[PDB]
Design a protein around this ligand. Structure first.
Ligand SMILES: O=c1[nH][nH]c(=O)c2cc(OCCc3ccccc3F)ccc12
Lengths: 194, 198
């Protein structure tokens, strides 16, 4: 049941579809980035159309919607990576084993400026940096700490009912960590330069 | 969307169903077990009915069935563990971030065994305070596999030059696999828990 803003894929399950500048979908994502990265130069933005990844994600969302009894568990966040990992993320999404102050999961930033550090979006031979815009099932979150391998239990008297993610600051989060596969869908890849 | 032989759970999402000796369901797991673990005795075998783990697992199996070419992608394997992990694995399944280092390591992942005798070892199914040992019987999406190597954090690529086209799992020996290692959540479904003792 693939989102309707996706474009046809000739019966295939994976495409990276480059967005054309000045149409409304591109403008939205660029606005989100330029809010804190207006000083960088956007080379391209690509919509990630991965049927499998999407399917596992929507399963996890339907379950987190049921478990939390409401429907507001998703945030749009950013994630900068190195060029060598982009093929992997396109196809297989985010993976904590590849990645840790608030836990050993995957880190997603609220501000593009954070993902834009060269430590995260390392620039390649030709100078290019890479950053995803990510649907993340953050659901109910709590402050993290170093060494977590899964979020803390909501009530440590029912030790297996867990928060859905952790953050550096609960009242005003600026990063999120999720510890399970298919809790995050990589939705756009922004290719940009300093 | 759940198997039509599970017990009605009444819109619960999880329960454990103790099995009866004599029934084919119980007797086949015991045979499987005692085929290599004849000198341990089974206390009980519980069918794990966990709707969410099932749902995400069946989705991964569907995906591997589509991607591989009429491959028998699923195996029934064993997993010894300690009492303290049973609650977690029951509700949440297997989590590579939690897994032990295997005496012979073929990657950093969750390990499953062909032979119950392997899982039966004290280092996996640690006896709890009452002498009870615990072993899962697991549906594991082994897919297309290759010999692993200790440094692996994901299965290897089938071709170095296409790094994202991955083996689904890895094994200690391709010609006579006795263990498998899986590197992703929801690739193994914990279907029965064997409680056993010496
Ligand atoms: O955008 C990102 N891509 N990849 C990352 O690994 C990443 C990691 C990341 O850390 C935030 C957590 C943190 C804060 C302070 C000291 C140490 C820490 F770990 C933020 C953003 C990103």
């Amino acid at each position: 049941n693939l989102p309707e803003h996706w474009t046809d894929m000739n019966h295939q399950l994976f495409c990276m579809v480059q967005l054309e500048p000045g149409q409304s979908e591109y403008n939205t994502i660029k606005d989100k980035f330029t809010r804190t990265c207006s000083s960088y130069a956007i080379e391209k933005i690509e919509r990630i159309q991965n049927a499998f990844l999407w399917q596992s994600y929507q399963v996890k969302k339907r379950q987190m919607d049921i478990k939390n009894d409401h429907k507001n568990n998703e945030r749009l966040l950013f994630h900068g990576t190195d060029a060598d990992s982009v093929p992997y993320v396109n196809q297989h999404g985010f993976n904590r084993s590849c990645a840790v102050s608030y836990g050993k999961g995957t880190y997603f930033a609220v501000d593009a400026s954070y993902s834009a550090k060269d430590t995260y979006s390392k620039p390649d031979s030709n100078g290019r940096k890479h950053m995803y815009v990510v649907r993340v099932l953050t659901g109910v979150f709590t402050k993290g700490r170093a060494g977590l391998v899964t979020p803390p239990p909501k009530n440590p008297h029912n030790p297996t009912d867990l928060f859905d993610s952790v953050t550096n600051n609960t009242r005003s989060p600026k990063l999120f960590v999720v510890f399970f596969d298919n809790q995050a869908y990589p939705e756009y890849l922004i290719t940009f330069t300093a």
